[PDB]
Write a protein that binds this DNA or RNA. Structure first.
Ligand code: NA
Ligand code: NA
Ligand code: NA
Length: 326
DNA sequence: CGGCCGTACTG
DNA sequence: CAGTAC
DNA sequence: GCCG
């Protein structure tokens, strides 16, 4: 399916380098180019052809042809020797490019250096100790078990609750880097107060081991980001997200948390070109603005009972989860 | 050239 | 607010 | 990085 593998592998290396260095826009640009290459119907055979692909410009075309005709990309030999370390540091949940840069300027070079000498935020300390477990993508089965665990715990409070694992799991991938469980209820009200009760229950059985983000001093359209671990010998710690939402937002939440991230932003961009706005909450008319183009409030929500409804209103052919990698 | 999805917590 | 993440 |  990817006729340009020999090419996308090389471009991915540069993209990642720019990314870990904080050059976010340059990296986003590469991503869209790389994605466009992956979906191209055949191997790219010329500069002109490459440039013709939406998402690929002169700069990228030039590199593509260089790889195509020589089998290599010289720019790769000129990547700063600091990239591997910056990557290692930003692999720690809670630590981004700014923190990786700080640690590198202070002279740190290994996870051991970070452990013994770096100032760590509460979230980062958790990210560090579970570094390896978090970098390992778990097999689909485990994801299923984690999702079932959350479902049973929630349904024990209200059998009507609907629980759905999204992210890569819903996109049908064989391995998952995390598990995101979306919860709601058909009656449009019984989702209230589930968060608190659900968390304490999961903590009761030792399933939840660490909390990264969880504002339990607020009961509104919530989110929990933490660490879970299935009972039983040898089980690793895994990243678990729990989002509880009202029934009216279910479709957009399902669409957003299923992803991918590239797909979400592409859809949102597309929504704006049609005078609309897409968020994990809803599909609305264009947001309201002030004299100087400043946003002074939300647009009007357009009811979307199902994901199909979002595509319909955007004038786009429906896409199944497995087809949303970008 | 300037904009690049829209939004949720931490400290 | 600046950073990080979904 | 790309695009308009
Ligand atoms: Na192009
Ligand atoms: Na990180
Ligand atoms: Na909605």
């Amino acid at each position: 399916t990817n006729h340009n593998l020999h090419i996308t592998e090389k471009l991915e290396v540069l993209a990642k380098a720019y990314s870990v260095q904080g050059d976010k826009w340059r990296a986003l640009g590469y991503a869209k180019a790389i994605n466009a290459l992956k979906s191209f119907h055949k191997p790219v055979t010329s500069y002109q052809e490459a440039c013709s692909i939406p998402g690929i410009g002169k700069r990228m075309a030039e590199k593509i042809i260089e790889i195509l005709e020589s089998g290599h990309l010289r720019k790769l030999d000129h990547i700063s020797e600091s990239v591997p370390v910056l990557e290692l540091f930003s692999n720690i949940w809670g630590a981004g490019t700014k923190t990786a840069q700080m640690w590198y300027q202070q002279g740190f070079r290994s996870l051991e250096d970070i452990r013994s000498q770096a100032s760590l935020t509460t979230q980062q300390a958790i990210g560090l100790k579970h570094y390896s477990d978090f970098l390992e993508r778990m097999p689909r089965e485990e994801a299923t078990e984690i999702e079932q665990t959350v479902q049973k715990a929630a349904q024990a409070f209200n059998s009507g609750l609907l629980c759905v694992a999204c992210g890569s799991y819903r996109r049908g991938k064989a391995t998952c880097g995390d598990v995101d469980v979306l919860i709601t209820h058909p009656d449009g009200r019984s989702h209230r107060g589930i968060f608190s009760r659900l968390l304490d229950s999961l903590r009761q059985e030792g399933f939840l081991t660490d909390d990264l983000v969880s504002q339990e001093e607020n009961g509104q359209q919530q989110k929990y980001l933490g660490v879970c671990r299935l009972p039983g010998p040898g089980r690793r710690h895994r990243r678990l997200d729990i989002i509880v939402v009202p029934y009216s937002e279910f479709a957009c939440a399902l669409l957003y948390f299923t992803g991918s991230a590239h797909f979400n932003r592409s859809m949102a961009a597309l929504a704006k070109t049609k005078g609309m706005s897409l968020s994990e909450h809803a599909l609305s008319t264009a947001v309201v603005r002030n004299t100087h183009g400043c946003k002074v409030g939300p647009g009007r929500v357009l009811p979307t009972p199902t994901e199909k409804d979002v595509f319909r209103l955007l004038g786009l052919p429906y896409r199944e989860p497995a087809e949303r990698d970008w």
